[PDB]
Amino acid sequence: EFTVSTTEDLQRYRTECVSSLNIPADYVEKFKKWEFPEDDTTMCYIKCVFNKMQLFDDTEGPLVDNLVHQLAHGRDAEEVRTEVLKCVDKNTDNNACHWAFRGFKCFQKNNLSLIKASIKK
Template identity: 50%
Template sequence: MKYFVAVLLLAAVVFADAEWKIQTAENLNAYRPECANSLSIPEDKVNEYKKWNFPNDEKTQCYIKCIFGKMGLFNEKDGFNVEHLVKQLGQGKNETIIRPEVVKCADKNPQKTNACQWAYRGFDCFKKAHLDLVQTSVKKN
């Protein structure tokens, strides 16, 4: 019985991951208004985000968490999905080079900060280390 349960759990993980797809600019453009509306973020601030200007404030942190959540890259319980991030940022590049950078930025929340701060901290790390990869990863495929 234990073996059967283990196989089912493994199949569920594999199937769930198989459903995830690399996110595109179209996905990001769909998520932006959803996240902005749910957080009451004004249009001028969203326009700044589109220019890759992300101030370290509570609304921006939660906006990043919302976007990453919708993209399947972050959730409040587990934090960052390293496999999805490697695929999203790598997109055909050598994943063995990208993985250590992703792992470094995708911390396990040692500061025990709230989910918005946690998501923002990881995003800020990705952005500082590899802004070009972050920007390219959501361009039209």
């Protein structure tokens, strides 16, 4: 199946992508703080992280079922699906890095968070 990502997963993925993409150190600090400049370096970073979280695929685009699992955090699936779908679009400029980042940006606007705190009984 697919499993939801935690802060720990995100941490690991950050490390794996920083290595595999050769991210300059000035960027790593920003990324540690969840601060994302709108440039190619960052956009490919987001793509890599989404790939690893299984939220985005370079051919199929944003992966809605998984996103909903990830963003729902127990909230009502269907309203989340409706929100997510508002963020889905085609790979208009044939740049998968742009594609991933455009969705990330839309999620931001629609106040949809990949990593949220969680209260359990």
